[PDB]
Amino acid sequence: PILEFLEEWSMENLEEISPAAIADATKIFVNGCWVGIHKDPEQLMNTLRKLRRQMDIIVSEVSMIRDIREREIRIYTDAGRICRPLLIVEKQKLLLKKRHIDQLKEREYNNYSWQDLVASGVVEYIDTLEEETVMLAMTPDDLQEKEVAYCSTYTHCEIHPSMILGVCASIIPFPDHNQSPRNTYQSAMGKQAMG
Amino acid sequence: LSEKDVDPVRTTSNDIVEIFTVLGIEAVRKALERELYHVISFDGSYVN
Amino acid sequence: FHYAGVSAKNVTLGVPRLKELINISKKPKTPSLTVFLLGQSARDAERAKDILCRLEHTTLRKVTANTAIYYDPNPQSTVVAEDQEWVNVYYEMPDFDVARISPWLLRVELDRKHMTDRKLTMEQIAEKINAGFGDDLNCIFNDDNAEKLVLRIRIMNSDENKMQEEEEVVDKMDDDVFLRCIESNMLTDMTL
Amino acid sequence: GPSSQNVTEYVVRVPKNTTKKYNIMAFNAADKVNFATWNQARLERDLSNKPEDQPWLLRVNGKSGRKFKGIKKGGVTENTSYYIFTQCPDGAFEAFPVHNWYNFTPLARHRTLTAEEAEEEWERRNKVLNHFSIMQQR
Amino acid sequence: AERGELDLTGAKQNTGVWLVKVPKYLSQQWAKASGRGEVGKLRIAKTQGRTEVSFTLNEDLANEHPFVLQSVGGQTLTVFTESSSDKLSLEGIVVQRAECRPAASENYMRLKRLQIEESSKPVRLSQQLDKVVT
Amino acid sequence: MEPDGTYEPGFVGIRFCQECNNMLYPKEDKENRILLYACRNCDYQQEADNSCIYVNKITHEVDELTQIIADVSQDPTLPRTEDHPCQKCGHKEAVFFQSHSARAEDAMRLYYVCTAPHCGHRWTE
Amino acid sequence: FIQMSVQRIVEDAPPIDLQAEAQHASGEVEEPPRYLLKFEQIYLSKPTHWERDGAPSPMMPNEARLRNLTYSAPLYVDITKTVIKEGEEQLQTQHQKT
Amino acid sequence: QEKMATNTVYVFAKKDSKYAYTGECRSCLENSSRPTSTIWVSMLARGGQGAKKSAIGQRIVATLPYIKQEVPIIIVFRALGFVSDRDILEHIIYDFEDPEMMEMVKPSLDEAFVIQEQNVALNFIGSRGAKPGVTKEKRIKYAKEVLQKEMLPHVGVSDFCETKKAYFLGYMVHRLLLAALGRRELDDRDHYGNKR
């Protein structure tokens, strides 16, 4: 379906062109395969992002990255990429609002869930290749502070920083007042604590 | 060593195969002891 | 790693040095010599600079700013109009074999700061390359006070024996191409 | 004149069937094709593979004019379609489907390279030592 | 005169034709219109320094397609025909390229998604099998 | 003449053959002082324009305002600057960055790209 | 893996055909018996165990651990056998569930 | 299990070997024929025949699957059917206005000259790979079968994407050449962006 959509949209097939007359165009890749070229990557990239957040392209299974200094766009739909959920910030503000939080509390009798939340397009799954391109903000606090800070260009935001921790590093209290090898040593001993 | 104005007395090397070819087996005994002495002093610990 | 002076990526430290030393390695990871200086050279920076220059293994490739190959059979009508003054300068330079020199020209441009640091002269280079390749490699050079430093190179032959006796024992190698091999070797070999 | 507010409209016809199948003949702009020189041309199925599964062989003005080889469009229009639009004397358009798209590329004339007798061997010795003389000794 | 000879009359008449890329649903409607002798109308409107080309669908076949023109300076195209009478002919030269784009944006997608359903849907088994004995 | 005269004699690789479209090589005419370029597989030959056929080590390519394509300005992770006045348009919002190469070798010099549609103009500082 | 990959693999590209060496030393009139087999729909029961009796039953993953069984389920596939002999008949195809 | 990613080209340094640079591309969509993976595109270094041109660090070669010896990449292009250098360079250079790259590719074209025809180029690949036999034509058929099926299978396995495959080789040369001018930084071995 990704190949279908691109083909109907504007992407020229490799045999439709003479490279020396159109080589300046942005290249398109699908799972490491060179499908064609395109003369307007910003709109198309914006459109693809809009579709994935709209659920017309399978969000968890599709990563989409633009590398502008090489004027190419690769997309991957293969299995085995590690990706994490992140908040989408737009116009230098959160796209998630308090109305959604009250909707989430409502679930004690409501059928509204995390999947509904993703469909609101306020969160996206971002793999390590795509994580190379985002401007990720540590906290909404910093994103507010920006009026004096150096950066005002954020695109994603951390849902919380302790989440960078795996299961055993998560049982342990105040891990940052630990000298770092202590955290590794506990995670081992944690498997050996019987219970 | 053969070049002009280079002191032919104190000029030395951290290499051992070359020290042997030029200076001969006794000089290796001294230089090799010195190089071993040098790694040990760096690491700070003393060896008798 | 232990930061010290200018040096450092010097002498492997510790267990990797113990293994290197104790194995009697033919190829140490960082071989060095601590050289001491004498006379005025033991107390003067510029004298030390001079001895260092003799010691420093510099090759012509390290020295060259630029190279070019030009098609110019007769100098006295040079394709590079600015070169025209050396032709005035070099008409008496073996004036007979201008009828013999190949129409393929090599031109080298040298940096004045880098040439200064090695304290090297243009005549020593001409003499070094001439001596290495032989009288066949006909070299001429410029005035040291020019704002552009240039070396002008053609290739000559042995005159008498080359009259297409059988088919010229070269197998008709292209002469430009041979000039690249001169440029390949001239840079990579010449230990000025 | 009217040319600056001209509006034109034509009917479009798409006949269910045609006696002749419709093809594309494509050339590279780099190939500088000149149809004015095409006094004569032949179009035959290729013979390397020694019918409906083989590339095309195009011979223009015979052995003196240019010769081209035709390869079938490897990609397939599954999400698109290609059509030819033609004007008819009645004042309408007719559109015809593309049955095939063929990519035509120049073969070389008397360029001549045996590359078999001892060229593989000469290559082992090859130091870009020669180039013209070996082509001549043929 | 021979079977292997190509007719160059069309070429020699300098006949020009247009090449247009079109979406599947339109070709599918033309495949449903068969050969009635109409599928719609094509309209071309030019100004002082701009030219606008479009197609409009038949009301019946529905029961605006803008055209985007593409440079032909990059490749040279003509067309040949393989008759049932075994007589090959060169009909003319391609003088223009174009792509037919949809006017509907997002709603379209649903049709496409429906289209996706039509292309993609044989049973990937999955329904287990509850159980069998024979 | 002057040392200000730029160094671009025409590097030039392709102007290949006109018939079979393969690469041309220099070769001599000792009779007319003319360079010729010939295809090795055909009899076609034509005179050369410049006597230059190869140069090496401009060493200083400054590649400072070339290859750096203007679309770089859309990148959100690059630092926008309040430092004003593109040198072409009367608008700030230059995006800037170091080197972005391996052949830069030691550069710390900033490169500025105006990001509004009125320029695309780029310049070093 | 179950919902796509397994079905995809048996549907994919292993159709097979076989034909005896008939008309050996002699023959003529006919065309060497040939047979074609192709695999289609795939089926997977809930995990099952079979007692020595042969009686199949719903297995429970705990029972599997105490008795040391193997918590697995039986797999079945649609297979077709398909004749278009060299002339006299092209149909005589049979549906199985195996 | 963590592995290094599939059907993606990486250009990395390998200064310890004879290769100045290498382009590695492991080919397979894991969900197809599941065969193997190979192709290496390599920039040579450290050498000189003597008076050839001496400069070895432009002599680009390619390791192919099943082939017993390294072959120059231009030969592979000529085996795919392209015969004119401008067209190989068009497949290679895109921008067409980089004279520096054009001379960089130039010695590879100079090496190509002996096999300018497709059939002999295929036979050359045959001898470099297959067992020795008088079956030249069959050897060409084997060579054809390797380049169609066994080289970059993720690009296609049929005649119908044989042309497309040539564009992808040009991308592997292009990406390699880009790292060798230093216009592009090298791909790190341990970037999760390159793993599955």
Q: What's chain A's length in residues?
A: 195
Query: Do the chains contact at D7 and E21, CB–CB below 8 Å?
Result: no
Asked if residue H3 is part of any domain, the answer here is no
Helices (H), chain H: 73-79, 85-93, 99-112, 118-129, 136-145, 162-181
Cβ neighbours, 10 Å, residue G5: 11
Asked if residue H148 is part of any domain, the answer here is yes
Residue type for position C122:
M
Rg (Cα) of chain H, in Å, rounded? 17
Query: Do the chains contact at E131 and G46, CB–CB below 8 Å?
Result: yes
Residue type for position C35:
V
For residues H122 and H60, give the distance between their C-alpha atoms in angstroms, rounded to a whole number.
19
Which of these, F61, F55, F49, lies nearest to F103 by C-alpha position? F61
CA G67 distance to own-chain centroid: 31
Q: What's chain D's length in residues?
A: 138
Query: Do the chains contact at F3 and C147, CB–CB below 8 Å?
Result: yes
The CATH topology of domain C47-189 is Gyrase A; domain 2 (3.30.1360)
Residue H160 lies in domain: 10-196
How many domains are there within chain H? 1
Asked if residue H99 is part of any domain, the answer here is yes
Beta bridge partners of B12: C34
Phi, psi at residue H155, to the nearest 5°?
-90, -30
Q: Kindly tell me the sign of the dihedral angle through the C-alpha atoms of E89, E92, E97, E98.
A: negative
Q: Are G86 and G32 in contact (CB under 8 A)?
A: yes
Which of these, E91, E93, E95, lies nearest to E6 by C-alpha position? E91
Chain H residues 141-180 with a CB less than 8 Å from chain F: 179
Beta bridge partners of D96: D84
Query: Do the chains contact at A8 and E23, CB–CB below 8 Å?
Result: yes
Interface of chain F against chain D, CB under 8 Å?
Answer: 20-21, 40-42
Query: Do the chains contact at A21 and E113, CB–CB below 8 Å?
Result: no
Residues of H in contact with C68 (CB under 8 A): none
Q: Are A95 and A89 in contact (CB under 8 A)?
A: yes
Which residue, among D48, D49, D123, would best test binding to H if mutated, counting the most H CBs under 10 Å from its CB? D123
**Residue listed under structure tokens 């009139």:** G29
Residue D74 lies in domain: 1-138
Phi, psi at residue E18, to the nearest 5°?
-105, 145
CB-based contact, D105 to chain A, within 8 Å: no
Parallel, antiparallel, or unpaired: how do β-strands H61-63 and A93-94 relate?
Answer: unpaired
Residue type for position D110:
H
**Residue F52 annotated in ligand binding:** no
Q: What is the CATH number of the domain that holds H47?
A: 3.90.1110.10
Q: Are F49 and C57 in contact (CB under 8 A)?
A: no
The CA distances from residue E111 to A154, D82, E114, in Å, are 35, 21, 5
Cβ neighbours, 10 Å, residue F45: 13
DSSP letter assigned to residue H4 = B
Query: Do the chains contact at E126 and G2, CB–CB below 8 Å?
Result: yes
Which of these, A148, A153, A100, A99, lies nearest to A123 by C-alpha position? A100
For residues H79 and H72, give the distance between their C-alpha atoms in angstroms, rounded to a whole number.
11
Query: D114: Cβ–Cβ under 8 A, 6 or more apart, which residues?
Result: D138
For residues C151 and D137, give the distance between their C-alpha atoms in angstroms, rounded to a whole number.
41
Q: Are D93 and D13 in contact (CB under 8 A)?
A: yes
**Residue listed under structure tokens 């695309």:** F120
B and E make contact (3+ CB pairs below 8 Å): no
Residue type for position A178:
N
G and F make contact (3+ CB pairs below 8 Å): no
Phi, psi at residue E105, to the nearest 5°?
-105, -85
Which of these, A67, A66, A65, lies nearest to A76 by C-alpha position? A65
Q: Which long-range contacts (CB under 8 A, 24 or more apart) does H115-119 make?
A: H115/D115, H115/D119, H115/H75, H115/H78, H116/D111, H116/D113, H116/D115, H116/F41, H116/H78, H116/H83, H117/D113, H117/D115, H117/H78, H117/H83, H118/H78, H118/H79, H118/H81, H118/H83
What is the b/e burial string over C45-72, where b = at least 16 CB atoms within 10 angstroms of the residue's CB?
eeeeeebeeeeeebebeebbbbbbbbbb
How close is the nearest chain A Cα to the Cα of E53, in Å? 17
Query: What CATH number has the domain spanning F57-125?
Result: 2.20.25.10
CB-based contact, C185 to chain H, within 8 Å: yes
Parallel, antiparallel, or unpaired: how do β-strands F122-124 and F111-114 relate?
Answer: antiparallel
Residue type for position A71:
R
Beta bridge partners of C33: B13
Residue H34, judged by CB atoms within 10 A of its CB (0-12, 13-18, 19+), counts as exposed
Which residue, among H32, H94, H163, would best test binding to A if mutated, counting the most A CBs under 10 Å from its CB? H94
Rg (Cα) of chain C, in Å, rounded? 23
Q: Which long-range contacts (CB under 8 A, 24 or more apart) does F106-112 make?
A: F109/F64, F111/F64, F111/F65, F111/F68, F112/F81
For residues G35 and C70, give the distance between their C-alpha atoms in angstroms, rounded to a whole number.
76
Q: With both helix axes pointing from N to C terminus, report the angle between H85-93 and H162-181 in degrees, rounded to the nearest 10.
A: 70
Query: Do the chains contact at A7 and D80, CB–CB below 8 Å?
Result: yes
Residue A35, judged by CB atoms within 10 A of its CB (0-12, 13-18, 19+), counts as buried
Largest CA distance in chain D: 74
**Residue F42 annotated in ligand binding:** yes
Q: Where are the domains of chain F?
A: 12-56, 57-125
For residues A179 and B44, give the distance between their C-alpha atoms in angstroms, rounded to a whole number.
26
Extract the tokens encoding H37. 């993976």
Which of these, B28, B24, B46, B41, lies nearest to C21 by C-alpha position? B28
For residues A40 and H103, give the distance between their C-alpha atoms in angstroms, rounded to a whole number.
32
For residues A67 and D84, give the distance between their C-alpha atoms in angstroms, rounded to a whole number.
38
Residue type for position A112:
Y
The string of DSSP letters for chain E reads --TTBPB-HHHHTT-EEEEEEEEHHHHHHHHHHTTSS-SEEEEEEE-SS-EEEEEEE-TTTT--EEEEEE-SSSEEEEEEEE-TTS--EEEEEEEEEEEE--S--SHHHHHHHHHHHHHH-S--S-S-------
Query: H15: Cβ–Cβ under 8 A, 6 or more apart, which residues?
Result: none
User: Taking CA B5 as the corner, what is the angle to CA B3 and CA B8, rounded to the nearest 5 degrees?
Assistant: 70
Q: Enumerate neighbours of B (3 or more CB pairs within 8 A).
A: C
For residues H143 and H119, give the distance between their C-alpha atoms in angstroms, rounded to a whole number.
10
Residues of B in contact with C7 (CB under 8 A): none
CB-based contact, C38 to chain B, within 8 Å: yes
Query: A180: Cβ–Cβ under 8 A, 6 or more apart, which residues?
Result: none
Beta bridge partners of A29: A34, A74
Q: Enumerate neighbours of G (3 or more CB pairs within 8 A).
A: E
Which of these, E18, E17, E43, lies nearest to E97 by C-alpha position? E18
**Residue listed under structure tokens 């633009």:** A66
CB-based contact, B47 to chain C, within 8 Å: no
Q: Are H157 and H148 in contact (CB under 8 A)?
A: yes
Parallel, antiparallel, or unpaired: how do β-strands A156-157 and A136-137 relate?
Answer: parallel
Order of strands, sheet of F24-29, starting from the edge strand that comes earlier in the sequence: F24-29, F34-39, F45-47
Which of these, E80, E60, E125, E72, lies nearest to E97 by C-alpha position? E72
Q: Enumerate neighbours of C (3 or more CB pairs within 8 A).
A: B, D, F, H
CA C187 distance to own-chain centroid: 5
Query: C72: Cβ–Cβ under 8 A, 6 or more apart, which residues?
Result: C78, C79, C80, C103, C105, F51
Q: What is the 3-state secondary structure (H, E, C) of chain G?
A: CCCCHHHHHHHCCCCEEEECCCCCCCCCCCCCCEEEEEEEEEEECCCEEECCCCCEEECCHHHHHHCCCCCCCCEEEEEEEECCCCCCCCCCEEEEEC
How close is the nearest chain D Cα to the Cα of E19, in Å? 5
Extract the tokens encoding H104. 């960089």
Residue type for position D16:
K
Q: Are C101 and C138 in contact (CB under 8 A)?
A: yes
User: Taking CA A78 as the corner, what is the angle to CA A73 and CA A81, rounded to the nearest 5 degrees?
Assistant: 90
